[PDB]
């Protein structure tokens, strides 16, 4: 019963998700400049193909504010496979418990939007 506030970015190519410094935080007008900091966490589903063999699907990367989500305890910038960090200029390095996470029973994800001019790696698309 915890989830990202936003939809995921699907990785369609070999390049992992990353952003230039200052980019990558989803738009959320219910938040302040100090709040604009967090991580994306990769999740990879496995399902059986038509031929019967289990296979990995395209990875999906989900944004969580700093101090929330599966890596709520990780400090900003900590190195961990499948975790990348993003922060807008002016963000404060503190846990965002006042934003927290989404309960899927109560609210649907909002579409992850990034400001015009955000660089994305090959194989990624964003609204």
């Amino acid at each position: 019963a915890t989830a990202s506030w936003f939809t995921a970015l699907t990785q369609h190519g070999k390049e992992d998700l990353k952003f230039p410094r200052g980019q990558g935080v989803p738009i959320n007008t219910n938040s302040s400049p100090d709040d604009q900091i967090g991580y994306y966490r990769r999740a990879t589903r496995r399902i059986r193909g038509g031929d019967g063999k289990m296979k990995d699907l395209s990875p999906r990367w989900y944004f969580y504010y700093l101090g929330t989500g599966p890596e709520a305890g990780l400090p900003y910038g900590a190195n961990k496979d499948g975790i990348i960090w993003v922060a807008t200029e002016g963000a404060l390095n503190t846990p965002k418990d006042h934003i927290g996470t989404r309960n899927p029973a109560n609210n649907a994800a909002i579409v992850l939007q990034l400001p015009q001019g955000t660089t994305l790696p090959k194989g990624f698309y964003a609204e």
Partner: nanobody, 121 residues
Framework: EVQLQASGGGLVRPGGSLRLSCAAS????????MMWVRQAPGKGLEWVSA????????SYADSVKGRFTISRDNAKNTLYLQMNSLKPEDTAVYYC??????????????WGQGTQVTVSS
């Protein structure tokens, strides 16, 4: 059902102070981050502030930071907004709500009527 009723609005002079309250019912209040939002005449809804269940983690719109404080009393199922150094631009209907992310939040029916704040000489 989940209900959050705002009160405490009034008419004050610029520079004045007002404390808004929000009574929660129908859900476990302490389990939720909360927010205040406001809507001024002929303007879009503006997010004001947010607070975690534990009461120590907060943030504010740049337009109110340093003049307003959000707080909560979980034993009383109540959320507060203490407003100081009020400006005419703070005139609006104020609403409380469970925190939610949004891109250009619009008014929700489940917020109720809100509470009117008017700041004028």
């Amino acid at each position: 059902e989940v209900q959050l009723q705002a009160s405490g609005g009034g008419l004050v002079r610029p520079g004045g102070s007002l404390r808004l309250s929000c009574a929660a019912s129908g859900f476990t209040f302490s389990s939720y981050a909360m927010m205040w939002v406001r809507q001024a005449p002929g303007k879009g809804l503006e997010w004001v502030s947010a607070i975690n269940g534990g009461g120590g983690s907060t943030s504010y719109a740049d337009s109110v930071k340093g003049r307003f404080t959000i707080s909560r009393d979980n034993a009383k199922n109540t959320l507060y907004l203490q407003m100081n150094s009020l400006k005419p631009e703070d005139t609006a209907v104020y609403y409380c709500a469970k925190y939610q992310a949004a891109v250009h939040q619009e008014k929700e029916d489940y917020w109720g009527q809100g509470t009117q704040v008017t700041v004028s000489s």
